[PDB]
A paper describes a structure:
The titular member of this family, phosphatidylcholine transfer protein (PC-TP a.k.a STARD2), specifically binds and transfers phosphatidylcholine (PC) generated in the endoplasmic reticulum throughout the cell to modulate plasma membrane, lipid, and thermal homeostasis. The STARD2 subfamily, containing STARD2, 7, and 10, bind glycerophospholipids species.
C 2.18 Å structure of PC-TP in complex with PC 36:4 (PAPC) used to design proposed mutations to alter PC-TP PC binding. PC-TP adopted the expected STARd fold consisting of nine antiparallel beta sheets with four alpha helices. Our structure revealed clear electron density to guide the modeling of the bound ligand. Whereas the quaternary ammonium on the choline head group is stabilized by an aromatic cage consisting of Trp101, Tyr114, Tyr116, and Tyr155.
Residue numbers in the entry: 8 to 210
Amino acid sequence: FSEEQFWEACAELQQPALAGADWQLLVETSGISIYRLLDKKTGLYEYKVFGVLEDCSPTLLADIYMDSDYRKQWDQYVKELYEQECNGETVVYWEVKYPFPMSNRDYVYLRQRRDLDMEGRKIHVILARSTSMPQLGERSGVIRVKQYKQSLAIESDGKKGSKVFMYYFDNPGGQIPSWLINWAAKNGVPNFLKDMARACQNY
Ligand SMILES: CCCCC/C=C\C/C=C\C/C=C\C/C=C\CCCC(=O)O[C@H](COC(=O)CCCCCCCCCCCCCCC)COP(=O)(O)OCC[N+](C)(C)C
């Protein structure tokens, strides 16, 4: 990915930009808000996530976000996850546990972190994008996510936390049901965010 992309992801870290389209708020918990935008022609959603995470340093947060070995230990929604280098770049394989009776979703993607200093500010940017390799074909019974792009930008809130901004889009390869969106919004994601906070405490 080009440097532009790294500097572009930081754009809304300071002032969230949700006035361009119909961004509807989905969940507000642990000082984190998650907004979604629907594309009515396709049925697909985009997501943006902003807030702060008090009681977890920004540098350590960037570290737990890229530490897959640790991720597997504390995150109960990771079925399988491992990294490899293909052409000098880190390719990640990630299988997400979906609730019964839906199939699990798996991701093959490029991932790259850059620690910046813009306007004297410590910021950490993580970019992720969908790729394919012949050596890692599709698994029967696991939906391969073939369109997927994510950004994350971490910063200090000022006292003793991390200010964050994340953009997320994928095509999940099937009709994500309303009960699953409801489950994720009201239980899944809140429980995940607190598990993740706990994960900073025990690094
Ligand atoms: C900002 C820094 C603080 C940490 C991140 C903050 C907040 C993350 C929470 C939501 C982010 C917003 C929207 C994304 C919506 C769905 C995500 C899909 C499953 C997933 O991967 O989500 C984990 C997050 O884990 C979970 O929430 C576990 C609970 C869900 C697991 C199963 C869900 C089934 C499908 C749900 C569909 C409806 C979703 C509606 C959204 C409320 C992402 O983590 P990651 O950034 O490390 O990337 C992992 C690498 N990967 C993506 C390639 C697999």
